[PDB]
Design a protein that fits this description.
part of a larger assembly, 3 chains, A: mainly beta, C: mainly beta, 0% helix, binds a molecule of 3 linked components (NAG-NAG-BMA), binds a molecule of 2 linked components (NAG-NAG), binds 2-acetamido-2-deoxy-beta-D-glucopyranose, signal (chain B), virus entry into host cell (chain B), transmembrane (chain B)
Chain lengths: 115, 558, 107
């Protein structure tokens, strides 16, 4: 059994820095990674990045300049960060674990960017 | 200041690095259509995947003084006795004379015993055992590596495991390569680890794989295969590379690569693959960077870049160039024919290509001759001391030895200088007439950790075996590198320690200001009355070559 | 990068009808492909993994297969709950990319 839950502000102003934390249980973060996915209103899914068991991380070419991911193995939490938020950043962010390839997905948090 | 000490272990052969050899340089230039230009060579991305794997095995022997061999441990014992309680079953099973046989520890009874950490080992290669007929259970954690094919993975001990590290049943990994029967593999879901050093149990599950080889049992955490990265990687950005055409095949040469590449004269259709965004982008970005660094003020680009597949698996990106002086000749000659486009014009005027072919020919031949001179000297020093040559070739302290005609390499473990102590004497009291050639040392891998015994090597190296012994001499005087400074020993006794700046340095190639003096040999009188050899420093090449000659005479006398 | 093309963008079918979807990859990806389903509220669930291996607890009606460079998903019988979104996903080469998406509607 594996589960993931996201926690974020929900509403943020444009041009600020976003911060979302995904709490996960069922597997050790020291060996397996976690992937982040978003979906704006009415569009398909979009891959954001991933953090493997080690400190290495991969980010999308369209968000490498602003995306940044960190984690804490003791708390089994993965921190997501995104600076310089624009208007179109409004989307539902999900954190998807690698216990499998894409076996378990989180509920997701709906984020809106507006002043 | 003080440099860190190093305890280099002996490489087992997991990493073997072959090394280049001399070439047949042409006595006179013969290549056609010579031209200079920028180049970027790409190597096949081997994609090395590293991970840590746990190895389990048992030892069985007979007390009569016979029949000593190794055997693995079953799966149920690893997941129940070792994982749940950190204990090994006393009884062991093996095959003797092609027949099933069993054994027990001291023939006492069927019982269980706990495992204890290894006495010395390494902080990064933790190991455990039940004891420092007789039976012993051993468990060790070693590193593993796999290459792009992912069909096999080699352990730190040098033994290969013919099986894909990603094989399993959780995510349909049955299609992965494997060469062992189904009964020789097992996977556990929801498995919990337990560090035998603390027995604190894991906090979260991690699916564990288990394989039983003919000599030992290997277990590692099953991790899904990461997405595949670009298939090629930049090996080296060549600042200047000459291209020549000969025998229906191009010939690329450089001054830093020290290797000549050959292609089939046809540009590889890089556009045929969608990976151009990874290679075409990185390649072109390097062409302008190198060109703007030194060729923007004296050379001009000739057409668009070119890509060619060379022998050995290399992809060479090219950008032909020509000097401004040569450009003037082409445009001047073109104006005569007219009675701006360098492409489809180069190599056309034979009279203009004749001198450049000879000019660049000497440069290519000069590099080949110089490279052969350095390669033969480098290869000889490599055999004379692979540790120093291997360390400089990689930029970090490294261990290495020659496994015949190939050099095995491994990494060294560093240790602080405050964690090592040098004994006050190098003489052994167990037998007069013999004494260690280097000072003895005692150290600990980490602060507050257990102390280990060893010997001082060369260049702050720490040897775990005290075997450097020699017949002792009179008037002994030697300096040994110890941390930042040096440690002085005389008459096989610790005298004192001195810094690195307390000795004359000859950093420059030639120093004529050495205030030397005519030394007068002073030998103790015991050399004559007792006939005991006198000290002579380390053995010169002729001395070692002359010393073994005496051994032949002694054998003939015997 | 590898671009995934999903077709049809939308499909019309009746209750209990047999339907199939197809997703094509611009480059070879082997058996590394997964099919996802999104509920109306946004919950995402995996149906088929590694090209036709049914997920744990997924209904038996769902299935998948491969045909050359084309990957497909098939439903033996359609239920009132299966009329939701579907997306094809690849993970053979970095970065993983999703498909264009497909929405099932009543006929
Ligand atoms: C430069 O061109 C030569 C000649 O075309 C290339 O050598 C050829 O390489 C192909 C494979 O790419 C060989 O075909 C294979 O050969 C054997 C039977 O000989 C068999 O395994 C396969 O059925 C297949 O036909 C071909 O024999 C070989 N030709 C020769 C004359 O050696 C070479 O690879 C090219 N080099 C580069 C760096 O592009
Ligand atoms: C050196 O390069 C020149 C120019 O490409 C080559 O001369 C041409 O060769 C082709 C066939 O390969 C002919 O169709 C052309 O007519 C030749 N002349 C020109 C002006 O293009 C020449 O063959 C090359 N030299 C060698 C030894 O291969
Ligand atoms: C090359 O030199 C010219 C003349 O100084 C200059 O205008 C140009 O920007 C330079 N180009 C590069 C790529 O450095
Ligand atoms: C000593 O060094 C000086 C330069 O400092 C040099 O001119 C002189 O020749 C040297 N003397 C000897 C004896 O080498």
């Amino acid at each position: 059994q594996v589960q993931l839950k996201e926690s974020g502000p929900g509403l943020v102003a444009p041009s600020q820095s976003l911060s979302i934390t995904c709490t996960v249980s069922g597997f050790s973060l020291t060996t397996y990674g976690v992937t982040w996915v978003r979906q704006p209103p009415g569009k398909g899914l979009e891959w954001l990045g991933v953090i493997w068991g080690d400190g290495s991380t991969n980010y999308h070419s369209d968000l490498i300049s602003r995306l940044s991911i960190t984690k804490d193995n003791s708390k089994s939490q993965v921190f997501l960060k995104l600076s310089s938020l624009q208007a179109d950043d409004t989307a539902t962010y999900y954190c998807v674990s690698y216990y499998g390839y894409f076996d378990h997905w989180g509920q997701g948090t709906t984020l809106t960017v507006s002043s | 200041t003080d440099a860190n000490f190093y305890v280099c272990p002996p490489p087992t052969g997991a990493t073997v690095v072959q090394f280049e050899q001399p070439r047949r340089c042409p006595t006179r230039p013969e290549g056609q259509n010579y031209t200079e230009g920028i180049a970027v060579v790409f190597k096949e991305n081997i994609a090395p995947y590293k991970f840590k794997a746990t190895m389990y095995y048992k030892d069985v022997t007979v007390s009569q003084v016979i029949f000593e061999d190794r055997a693995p441990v079953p799966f149920e014992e690893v997941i129940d006795k070792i994982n749940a309680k950190g204990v090994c079953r006393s009884t062991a099973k093996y095959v003797r004379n092609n027949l099933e046989t069993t054994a027990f520890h001291r023939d006492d009874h069927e019982t269980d015993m706990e495992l204890k950490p290894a006495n010395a080992a390494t902080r990064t290669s933790r190991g455990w055992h039940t004891t420092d007929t007789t039976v012993n259970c051993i468990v060790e954690e070693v590193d593993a590596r796999s290459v792009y094919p992912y069909d096999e993975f080699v352990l730190a001990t040098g033994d290969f495991v013919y099986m894909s590290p990603f094989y399993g049943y959780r995510e349909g990994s049955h299609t992965e390569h494997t060469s062992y029967a189904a009964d020789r593999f097992k996977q556990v879901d929801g498995f919990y680890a337990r560090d035998l050093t603390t027995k604190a149990r894991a906090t979260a599950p991690t699916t564990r794989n288990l394989l039983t080889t003919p000599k030992f049992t290997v277990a590692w955490d099953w991790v899904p295969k990461r997405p595949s990265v670009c298939t090629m990687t930049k090996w080296q950005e060549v600042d200047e590379m000459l291209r020549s055409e000969y025998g229906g095949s191009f010939r690329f040469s450089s001054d830093a690569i020290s290797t000549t590449f050959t292609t089939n004269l046809t540009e590889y259709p890089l556009s045929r693959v969608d990976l151009g965004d990874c290679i075409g982008k990185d390649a072109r970005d390097a062409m302008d960077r190198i060109f703007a660094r030194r060729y923007n003020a004296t050379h001009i680009k000739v057409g668009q870049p070119q890509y060619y597949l060379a022998n050995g698996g290399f992809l060479i990106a090219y950008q032909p160039l020509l000097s401004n002086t040569l450009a003037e000749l082409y445009v001047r000659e073109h104006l005569r024919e007219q009675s701006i486009e360098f492409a489809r014009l180069q190599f056309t005027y034979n009279h203009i290509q004749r001198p450049v072919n000879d000019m660049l020919g000497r440069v290519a031949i000069a590099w080949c001759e110089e490279q052969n001179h350095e390669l033969t000297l480098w290869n000889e020093a490599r055999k004379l001391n692979p540790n120093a040559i291997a360390s400089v070739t990689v930029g970090r302290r490294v261990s290495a030895r020659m496994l015949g005609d190939v050099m095995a390499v491994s990494t060294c473990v560093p240790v602080a200088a405050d964690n090592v102590i040098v004994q006050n004497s190098m003489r052994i009291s167990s037998r007069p007439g013999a004494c260690y050639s280097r000072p003895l040392v005692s150290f600990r891998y980490e602060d507050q950790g257990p102390l280990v015994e060893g010997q001082l090597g060369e260049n702050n190296e720490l040897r775990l075996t005290r075997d450097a012994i020699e017949p002792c001499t009179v008037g002994h005087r030697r300096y040994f590198t110890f941390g930042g400074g040096y440690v002085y020993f005389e008459e096989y006794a610790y005298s004192h320690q001195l810094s690195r700046a307390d000795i004359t340095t000859v950093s420059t190639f030639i120093d004529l200001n050495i205030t030397m003096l005519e030394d007068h040999e002073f030998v103790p009188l015991e050399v004559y009355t007792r006939h005991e050899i006198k000290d002579s420093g380390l053995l010169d090449y002729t001395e070692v070559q002359r010393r073994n000659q005496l051994h032949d005479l002694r054998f003939a006398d015997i | 990068d590898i671009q995934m093309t999903q077709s049809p963008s939308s499909l019309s079918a009746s209750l209990g009808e047999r339907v199939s979807l197809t997703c094509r990859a611009s480059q070879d990806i082997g058996s590394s492909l997964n099919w996802l389903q999104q509920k109306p509220d946004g919950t995402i669930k995996r149906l088929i993994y590694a090209t036709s291996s049914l997920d744990s607890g997924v209904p038996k009606r769902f299935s998948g297969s491969r045909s050359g460079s084309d990957y497909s998903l098939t439903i033996s019988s359609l239920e009132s709950e299966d009329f939701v979104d579907y997306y094809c996903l690849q993970y053979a080469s970095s970065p993983p990319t999703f498909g264009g998406g497909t929405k099932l509607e009543i006929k």
